[PDB]
Every structure is written in structure tokens, then in C-alpha cells.
């Protein structure tokens, strides 16, 4: 391959061949960056036409997933060609190369991207518009009492910072899946839950206008209450159903979702 990744103790070192597409045509070093933060290269090797990136495991907008036995750090190499002689045309396409580092591990919340049958976890690549993201939120089964898990908000963006522009709220107002309210989406929480401390939901795939990297990050605010406690306008998981024109909670009284339509579920 044209990309070599060294997963070291507390950094990763990525070496990229400037002959990135095996055509023999060399890309510009300055057109390659690391992570959604677009960090610049740390060194070049002219003799071998390579470009090297070195970053701490938490730097440059990397994302960590904590599994029972493993820590997985995911990032990417961005190739963004400099302008053609006349910028209205493109002679060379951009590209994104996913980078991953796995480490044995030495309340914990987690989000996992599941296959459509929810049997297994699936790759983060190979989505096309028309596809559905199946997201499973969960919270570790620590000794402590039985819990119920909610997702207060999820925001999509072009980097792990959901406050950056552009961004798009998928879940808002303390558990209202607002993406399901509009257009022709089928986005919704799944019912019933597998367990009270697991919450599943599906989102129609989308992408951000004007973004030529064609990727998204989703950042969610997860929280728990005691398992037994009644859902209320502050703690709930509601979906909109266009057919019936109504909000519907995963559990609890129908009217707990009323605030979803008004766009404010804070209690004053």
C-alpha cells in the first residue's frame, strides 16, 4: 500500500507516498494533512518521495472508542489538491484515507455503529446517501443499581467539535429525534430497548453541503437516571412519526413528548 501507520506507545506516525495512486504522478506534500484538524506534515523524505505525519494519540481531532478489551483511535489522511490552472475545473479528485490504531486496555458510556440487523458492529466506511446509520448507545454494566440510558442530544459536524460550522442537530431538546420530524427521513429510536441501559436509533445518512471530504462526526450527550424512574420532559427518548403526525416516546406517557414540537423542553 501507499500508507504505512506505526502505532507507538503514545503517538502514531503515518508515512504516505506522494505517488499516492500508483500512477507515478506525485502529489504535493502540502496537499496532505492529518485528521479533521488538518495538521501539517512533520517531515519529508525527498529521496523516497514520502511525507510523514506524527501526532499524539489524542491530537488532530482523532476519535477514541473504548471497547471492553481494546482502545481504538481513528483518524484520517486528507488529500486536498491545490487549484487547477483555472479554478472552475478539477483535474485531480480529493481523497480521504482512514487511519486506525488498536491498543490493549490497561460509568463508561459508548456509541457503536451497528449493522442493520443489529447483530454486529460494522465498518465506518462504505456509506452512500440512501443508507442508514444504526447507532447503539450504551453504558457499562457496573455493579451499581439498574439504570436507564438517554441521549439528550446528538450533533453532526465535520470534526469532533460539534460547535464548529457546519453542524446539524440530529437529536435535540433532551431526547427529541428532530431529524425524524422533517423531509422524508425515517430516523427514529428503536422500540423496545434490548435493555434499559441501551438505547438504539437509526438515522438516514446525509452529508454536509460544500464538504469535499464527504465524512461526518457525530457527538452525543448521553446521561442516565435510575432504571425505575418515570420519564419526563427532561429525560425521554421521542421519535416523530409523520404518518400519524405525532411524537412517540420509547417509554412513558404520550404527553411527555409535547415539548418536542414547541422546541423547548427545559423546565423553568
Amino acid at each position: 500500500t501507499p500508507v504505512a501507520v506505526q502505532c507507538q506507545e503514545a503517538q502514531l506516525v503515518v508515512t504516505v507516498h506522494r505517488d499516492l495512486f500508483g500512477t507515478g504522478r506525485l502529489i504535493n506534500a502540502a496537499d496532505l494533512t492529518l485528521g479533521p484538524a488538518a495538521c501539517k506534515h512533520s517531515s519529508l523524505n525527498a529521496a523516497h518521495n514520502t511525507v510523514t505525519f506524527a501526532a499524539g494519540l489524542h491530537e488532530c481531532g482523532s476519535v477514541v472508542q473504548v471497547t471492553p478489551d481494546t482502545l481504538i483511535y481513528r483518524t484520517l489522511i486528507n488529500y486536498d489538491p491545490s487549484p487547477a490552472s483555472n479554478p472552475v475545473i478539477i483535474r485531480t479528485n480529493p481523497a480521504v484515507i482512514p487511519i486506525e490504531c488498536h491498543y490493549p486496555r490497561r460509568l463508561v458510556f459508548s456509541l457503536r455503529l451497528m449493522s442493520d440487523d443489529w447483530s454486529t458492529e460494522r465498518p465506518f466506511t462504505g456509506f452512500q446517501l440512501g443508507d442508514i446509520l444504526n447507532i447503539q448507545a450504551e453504558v457499562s454494566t457496573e455493579n451499581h443499581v439498574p439504570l436507564r440510558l438517554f441521549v439528550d442530544s446528538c450533533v453532526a459536524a465535520l470534526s469532533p467539535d460539534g460547535d464548529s460550522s457546519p453542524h446539524y442537530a440530529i437529536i435535540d431538546f433532551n431526547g427529541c429525534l428532530v431529524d425524524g420530524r422533517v423531509d422524508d427521513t425515517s430516523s427514529a429510536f428503536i422500540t423496545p430497548r434490548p435493555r434499559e441501559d441501551v438505547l438504539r436509533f437509526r438515522i438516514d445518512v446525509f452529508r454536509f453541503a460544500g464538504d469535499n471530504r464527504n465524512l461526518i462526526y457525530i457527538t452525543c450527550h448521553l446521561k442516565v437516571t435510575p432504571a425505575d424512574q418515570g420519564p419526563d420532559p427532561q429525560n425521554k427518548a421521542c421519535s416523530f412519526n409523520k404518518a400519524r403526525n405525532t411524537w412517540v416516546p420509547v417509554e412513558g406517557s404520550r404527553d411527555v413528548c409535547n415539548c418536542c414540537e414547541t422546541g423547548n423542553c427545559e423546565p423553568p
Binding site: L111, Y217, I218, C220, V224
Partner: peptide, 14 residues
């Protein structure tokens, strides 16, 4: 008690 958790990058292909 709560936490922010990020998932991605999700890459779209055509």
C-alpha cells in the same frame, strides 16, 4: 451523571 461521546469519522462513498 453523563458524558459526551464522539463517533466517526463516518466516510461516505459513491
Amino acid at each position: 451523571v453523563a458524558a459526551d461521546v464522539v463517533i466517526g469519522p463516518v466516510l461516505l462513498s459513491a
